[PDB]
DNA sequence: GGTTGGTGTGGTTGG
């Protein structure tokens, strides 16, 4: 469904400026 | 939020703002999880040591907000609330087990750049993302510190594992609660405070890309304390309730 | 304008 995307960020191919801390902690 | 930051505009769209009428105050943080439905705390709503128990019309959500306290034209919606469903078992008494409560509104959300719903996790989401070191993020406009933001603050914080989330605290933790927050020694700080609670803590999937609210700003014990740990409702454990709530009203 | 109109000794609201 239409949820957890978000239209200025996923939906523009563009990152918040800390969700890569986030990311990188899975790895 | 304390040691956050300010949140981009847009960054967090699920993010809701229970407001009290009379006086006019921010009450606690919240989320949005459909157009008609709102997840809290259950203790933002009923809390009888602090002589707290609202009722829909004492009551209102703000979406769609970055400013604390501005009026956000045509960017914001208010809405009011029909009905609260308060978890039956939520344990006020003693620790707060099943802090949750969901809000129906009057009315339907237009969904925009600024209001989304965040999506709630399914098994398979969850047993992949609730795991202790992986980092999930806290929003709201609750304390800077122990005891304030001009614009919705946010903070990334690590879960922790369960043992340590026990032995760091007197009071009973139990399957529906998880705790976040970075050890004595990881440097780092930052935590959820006062004024907090309800608020979303989300994960984004590194699946399909999309934020979960894995569990809600529950309690604490000061806010950002060397070797405490912030403590969040866990929202998959209480996901037959909420579905059953949505699916039945 | 702005994360938004048309006008504020603002307003459901700062500058
Ligand atoms: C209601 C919320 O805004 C708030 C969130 C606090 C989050 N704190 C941290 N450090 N992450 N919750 C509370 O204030 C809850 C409501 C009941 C009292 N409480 C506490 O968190 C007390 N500090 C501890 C407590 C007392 C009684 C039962 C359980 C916990
Ligand atoms: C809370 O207040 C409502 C209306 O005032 C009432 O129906 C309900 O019984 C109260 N619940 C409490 C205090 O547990
Ligand atoms: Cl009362
Ligand atoms: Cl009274
Ligand atoms: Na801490
Ligand atoms: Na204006
Ligand atoms: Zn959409
Ligand atoms: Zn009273
Ligand atoms: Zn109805």
Redesign the interface.
């Known amino acids: 469904?239409?949820?957890?995307?978000?239209?200025?960020?996923?939906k523009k191919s563009l990152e918040?400026?800390?969700?890569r801390?986030?990311?990188e902690?899975?790895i | 939020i304390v040691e956050g930051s300010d949140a981009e505009i847009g960054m967090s769209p699920w993010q809701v703002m229970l407001f009290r009428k009379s006086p006019q105050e921010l009450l606690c943080g919240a989320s949005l999880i459909s157009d008609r439905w709102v997840l809290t705390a259950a203790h933002c709503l009923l809390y009888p040591p602090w002589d707290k128990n609202f009722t829909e019309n004492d009551l209102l959500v703000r979406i769609g907000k970055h400013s604390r306290t501005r009026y956000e034209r045509n960017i914001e919606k208010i809405s009011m609330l029909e009905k609260i469903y308060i978890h039956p078992r939520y344990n006020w008494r003693e620790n707060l087990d099943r802090d949750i409560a969901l809000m129906k509104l009057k009315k339907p959300v237009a969904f925009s750049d600024y209001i989304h719903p965040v999506c709630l996790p399914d098994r398979e989401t969850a047993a992949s993302l609730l795991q202790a070191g992986y980092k999930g993020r806290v929003t709201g406009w609750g304390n800077l510190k122990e005891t304030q933001p001009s614009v919705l603050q946010v903070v990334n914080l690590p879960i922790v594992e369960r043992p340590v989330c026990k032995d760091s605290t007197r009071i009973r933790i139990t399957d529906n609660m998880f705790c976040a927050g970075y050890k004595p020694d990881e440097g780092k700080r930052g935590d959820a405070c006062e004024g907090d609670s309800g608020g979303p803590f989300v994960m984004k999937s590194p699946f399909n890309n999309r934020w979960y609210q894995m569990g809600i700003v529950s309690w604490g014990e000061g806010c950002d304390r060397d070797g405490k740990y912030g403590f969040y409702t866990h929202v998959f454990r209480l996901k037959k309730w909420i579905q059953k709530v949505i699916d039945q009203f």
């Open positions: 469904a239409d949820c957890g995307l978000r239209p200025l960020f996923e918040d400026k800390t969700e801390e986030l990311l902690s899975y």
